RNA sequence: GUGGGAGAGGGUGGUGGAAUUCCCGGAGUAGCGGUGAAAUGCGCAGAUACCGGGAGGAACGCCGAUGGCGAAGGCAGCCACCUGGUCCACCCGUGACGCUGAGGCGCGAAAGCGUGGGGAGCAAACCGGAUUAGAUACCCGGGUAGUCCACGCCCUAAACGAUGCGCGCUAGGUCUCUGGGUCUCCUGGGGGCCGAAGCUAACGCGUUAAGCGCGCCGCCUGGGGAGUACGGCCGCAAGGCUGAAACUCAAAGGAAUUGACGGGGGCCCGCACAAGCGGUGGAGCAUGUGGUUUAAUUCGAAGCAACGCGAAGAACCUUAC
RNA sequence: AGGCAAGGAGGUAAAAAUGU
RNA sequence: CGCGGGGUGGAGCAGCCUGGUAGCUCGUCGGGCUCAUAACCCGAAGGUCGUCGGUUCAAAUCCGGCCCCCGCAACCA
């Protein structure tokens, strides 16, 4: 509808779901895909295969904007981050690089007891 | 829970009861199906093993959904106990009262117990003084089904919501 | 089990405390904007600590990176 | 079962052709240890096949088997209280066995009259790409593919 | 004293990015969140994810250690300032000025409270959702106090090395940090680990002693009762410090050992499950039992290892009722 | 290409009250 | 006396409301599990919807009486 051919892909990976955002080289996201995008509601939503599927969908969507020249930024630790990456690699898209932008606090505010109990 | 929808019927000639409840008779299966298609809502066989196959012409899926919703609503309604002691802390009492009120608002019963030991002197009296006071406090929310009855080692009340 | 190089030894004699000498401290960070450990650097403990301090100072200025995102991984 | 990979039995192949697969199929068909009944049944089926689709039923049988052969199916592993249909591979011989079993099942699910006949029909259906056994196989595959989600829970 | 060192030692004044959250701006669409599964939850007023900027408040990733420091509580971004303690070399000055410490005075985490401020995250209570027999819990969603500051209090703690401080002595080896040296090895002061003698109830300790001593102070003299009561003192309170007895029990205890045990670990095994085939449970009947009747339904057998079992032969017999 | 190791993942280690 | 609302297998609750369509939990029975009990799972039994009756093709359902339950207005109490 407005096109680009070049840009990025933020793989946000949680345990509960892995979402792939596909943006331009600026930071204007055009094309995103989630677990609930591929039907998978619940546990599977965040499982590797689901993540992969989401990634594939995102790639396909991007291709509907001529998009080849995509950089890939892996944000966060999740089960599907590697699988998503693999999917992207497979896809048929011009993957620039597999950069890793994990959002790790430089000792930030006290996390929830759960993700904590880390001490 | 679950009936034969429009074309799931080979039950020959059907009791054409709409979602309205109106009889169109003993139509063919096919005729009935056609009608359903035209009317948009499915000929669902609520009694295939009957005097004509009871062809209730509502959307089956929609009907199911409705039923589900109703069921869900039914759950959300329940008994909530507030167990005092004979000796009362006033702040605590207040808090309990508030909780009871909240429960009643929500739609939920408040069975208001006390905890008695032995020492059954002014124990029952104390219980009465407590529970009755509590009732007085929140008459707007609940009125008492069960008065402060002796349970030997408890004093039970049941505050039941004013309107349903 | 780790035997490839020593950032101390691959390097010649210099001033650790010199933080503006920023090209040379870049060796003591990883590929990420992170300090290399005692075990990868192989400086004296004291020396190591001094280096770390210098790195921190540099970062605070703006000369060295505070963090990176790991590439191509 | 614990120690060794437990050896798979080599049979006398068919005395009418020279095929172990055929023998296996006959055995599967055979309930109660009534082989020289089920062998007869098998040959009747073969004859029926010949009468209809006029190829040497052995080849036809093979084709049918190939058609039913599943490659990924579902086991069941409980994980966190939830039971999962774990989609994994099926090993060659095992897969073949499964296919054979399915064929037999289909033959005995069929509403047609006699022993040979049903089997023959089933085989023909399998060859075609339709019938009961094939359908079952397809369903199994789907179950793998509907639950490809859990894959990583490999054994 | 002089010279030199290390250090998250303490305080005061600043600052630096990551992160989170919150808002503005975009770009964009059907969910995100969450979990063992889910559900509440938020979202079309357009979230979640992504970029840009701002507002903050807390906390300091990597270094990082098994490390350093303090007397202990404790202490981590970095910088500056104020400053404590300490170690070493020289052996230079001083000459016994020392060690301890009832009481005293001071410190003292966390929580707590008082007053004022702030408040992003987290988060008791609390409101929800699940979970469950129940759920006032573990799990999830929110959420106030409180975490943060200033000022005041409070003073407890597994305030632990569960080891009071000082000095002398009595094998080494090892790794470490730190200081001097004539520096592949010496010599100081820390921090660990392994061990000579010795000790110890063993465990273990073992030059950083729990060994040999000497100095001194604290405390113990069975467990509960009980850190309770009573009094006293302190405290805004919460409480704390000081601290019994009556009665009661003939144990409470520690350390090991042998087992047994564990929803501890590892290595193993069995038709133990899986894979496969065929059954029982459903039907009738055959029995044996349980139970109930009866004049008696003889007695025995009890989860596997009782139940088509003693019975390998009950019409009378057998047979015991 | 294989050899391991050290690290970082992430998955899995569900639940399940009692006793003469 | 008024008015309101209610009445469902043994107990608590949905349905009425939308004329055809009786669920849910607790208990009762039987079985399984277990060493044994609880819990757990499985079945089984069990409701004509107060009633007279009407409807209507057909009512738990729509209508009323009567019976009640419930609160309040109410004198002797
Ligand atoms: Mg000096
Ligand atoms: Mg917006
Ligand atoms: Mg120290
Ligand atoms: Mg001198
Ligand atoms: Mg002193
Ligand atoms: Mg003193
Ligand atoms: Mg206040
Ligand atoms: Mg929270
Ligand atoms: Mg709940
Ligand atoms: Mg709750
Ligand atoms: Mg919470
Ligand atoms: Mg405060
Ligand atoms: Mg002590
Ligand atoms: Mg030493
Ligand atoms: Mg030792
Ligand atoms: Mg001793
Ligand atoms: Mg105390
Ligand atoms: Mg012991
Ligand atoms: Mg089996």
CATH superfamily of chain A, by name, is Ribosomal protein S11/S14
Number of domains of chain A: 1
Helix and strand pattern of chain A: EEEHEHE
The distinct bound ligands, ions and cofactors come out as: magnesium ion
CATH topology name of chain A, in short, is Nucleotidyltransferase, domain 5
Assembly type of the chains comes to: part of a larger assembly
Order of helices and strands of chain C: HHH
Please give the largest β-sheet of chain A. Answer: 5 strands, mixed
Label the CATH architecture of chain A: 2-Layer Sandwich
Report the top-level CATH class of chain C: Few Secondary Structures
Pfam family, one (chain D): Ribosomal_S7
Keywords (chain D): Ribonucleoprotein, Ribosomal protein, RNA-binding, rRNA-binding, tRNA-binding
GO cellular component, one term (chain D): small ribosomal subunit
InterPro entries (chain D): Ribosomal_uS7 (IPR000235), Ribosomal_uS7_bac/org-type (IPR005717), Ribosomal_uS7_CS (IPR020606), Ribosomal_uS7_dom (IPR023798), Ribosomal_uS7_dom_sf (IPR036823)
Descriptive account of the structure:
The structure is cut from a larger assembly and holds chains A (119 residues), B (164 residues), C (73 residues) and D (155 residues). By secondary structure, chain A is of the alpha/beta class. In chain A, 23% of the residues lie in helices and 28% in strands. In chain A, β2 and β3 form a beta hairpin. The radius of gyration of chain A is 15 Å and the shape is globular. With 164 residues, chain B is of the alpha/beta class. In chain B, the strands form 3 sheets. In chain B, strands 1-4-5-2-3 form a 5-stranded mixed β-sheet. Chain B has a 4-stranded mixed β-sheet with strand order 6-8-11-10, covered by helices on one side. A two-stranded parallel ribbon of chain B has the order 7-9. Chain C is mainly alpha-helical and 73 residues long. Chain C has a single domain (1-73), classed as 30s Ribosomal Protein S18. In chain C, 34% of the residues lie in helices and 0% in strands. Classes of the chains: A alpha/beta (119), B alpha/beta (164), C mainly alpha (73), D mainly alpha (155). The A-C interface holds A 73-74, 97-102, 106 and C 66-67, 69-73. Chain A binds 3 RNA strands through β1, β2 and β3. Chain A: GO terms for molecular function: rRNA binding; structural constituent of ribosome. Chain A: This is Small ribosomal subunit protein uS11. Chain A: Pfam families: Ribosomal_S11 (PF00411). Chain A: Part of the 30S ribosomal subunit. Interacts with proteins S7 and S18. Binds to the C-terminus of IF-3; however exactly how IF-3 interacts with the 30S subunit is unclear. May contact the C-terminus of Era.
């Amino acid at each position: 509808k407005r096109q680009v051919a070049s840009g990025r892909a933020y793989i946000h990976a949680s345990y509960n779901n892995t979402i792939v955002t596909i943006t331009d080289p600026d930071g204007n996201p055009i094309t995103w895909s989630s677990g609930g995008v591929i039907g998978y509601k619940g546990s599977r939503k965040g499982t590797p295969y689901a993540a992969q599927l989401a990634a594939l969908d995102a790639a396909k969507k991007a291709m509907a904007y001529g998009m080849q020249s995509v950089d890939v930024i892996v944000r966060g630790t999740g089960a599907g981050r590697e699988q998503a990456i693999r999917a992207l690699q497979a896809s048929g898209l011009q993957v620039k690089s597999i950069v890793d932008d994990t959002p790790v606090p430089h000792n930030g505010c006290r996390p929830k007891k759960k993700f904590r109990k880390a001490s | 829970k679950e009936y034969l929808t429009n074309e799931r019927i080979r039950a020959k000639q059907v009791r054409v009861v709409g979602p309205d409840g109106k009889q169109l008779g003993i139509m063919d299966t096919r005729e009935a199906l056609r009608l359903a298609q035209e009317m948009d809502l499915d000929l669902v066989l609520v009694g295939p093993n009957a005097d004509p196959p009871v062809a209730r012409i509502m959307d089956y899926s929609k009907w199911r959904y409705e039923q589900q919703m109703a069921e869900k609503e039914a759950r959300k309604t329940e008994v909530k106990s507030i167990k005092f002691r004979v000796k009362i802390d006033e702040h605590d009492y207040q808090t309990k009262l508030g909780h009871i009120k909240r429960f009643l608002q929500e739609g939920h019963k408040v069975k208001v117990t006390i905890m008695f030991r032995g020492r059954e002197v002014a124990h029952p009296e104390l219980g009465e003084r407590i529970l009755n006071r509590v009732t007085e406090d929140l008459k707007d929310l609940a009125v008492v089904e069960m008065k402060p009855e002796m349970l030997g080692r408890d004093m039970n009340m049941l505050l039941a919501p004013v309107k349903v | 089990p780790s035997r490839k190089a020593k950032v101390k030894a691959t390097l010649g004699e210099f001033d650790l405390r010199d933080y503006r000498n920023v090209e040379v401290l870049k060796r003591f960070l990883s590929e990420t904007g992170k300090i290399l450990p005692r075990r990868r650097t192989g400086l004296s403990a004291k020396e190591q600590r001094i280096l770390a301090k210098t790195i921190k100072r540099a970062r605070i200025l703006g000369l060295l990176p505070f963090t990176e995102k790991l590439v191509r991984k | 079962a614990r120690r060794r990979r437990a050896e798979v039995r080599q049979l006398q192949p068919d005395l009418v052709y020279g095929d172990v697969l055929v023998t296996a199929f006959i055995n599967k068909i055979m309930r109660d240890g009534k082989k020289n009944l089920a062998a007869r049944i098998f040959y009747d089926a073969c004859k029926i096949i010949q009468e209809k689709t006029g190829q040497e039923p052995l080849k036809v049988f093979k084709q049918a088997v190939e058609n039913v052969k599943p490659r990924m199916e579902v086991r069941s592993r409980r994980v966190g209280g939830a039971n999962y249909q774990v989609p994994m591979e099926v090993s060659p011989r095992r897969q073949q066995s499964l296919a054979l079993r399915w064929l037999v099942q289909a033959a005995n699910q069929r509403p047609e009259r006699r022993a040979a006949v049903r089997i023959a029909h089933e085989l023909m259906d399998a060859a075609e790409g339709k019938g009961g056994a094939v359908k079952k196989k397809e369903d199994v595959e789907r179950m793998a593919e509907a639950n490809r989600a859990y894959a990583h829970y490999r054994w």
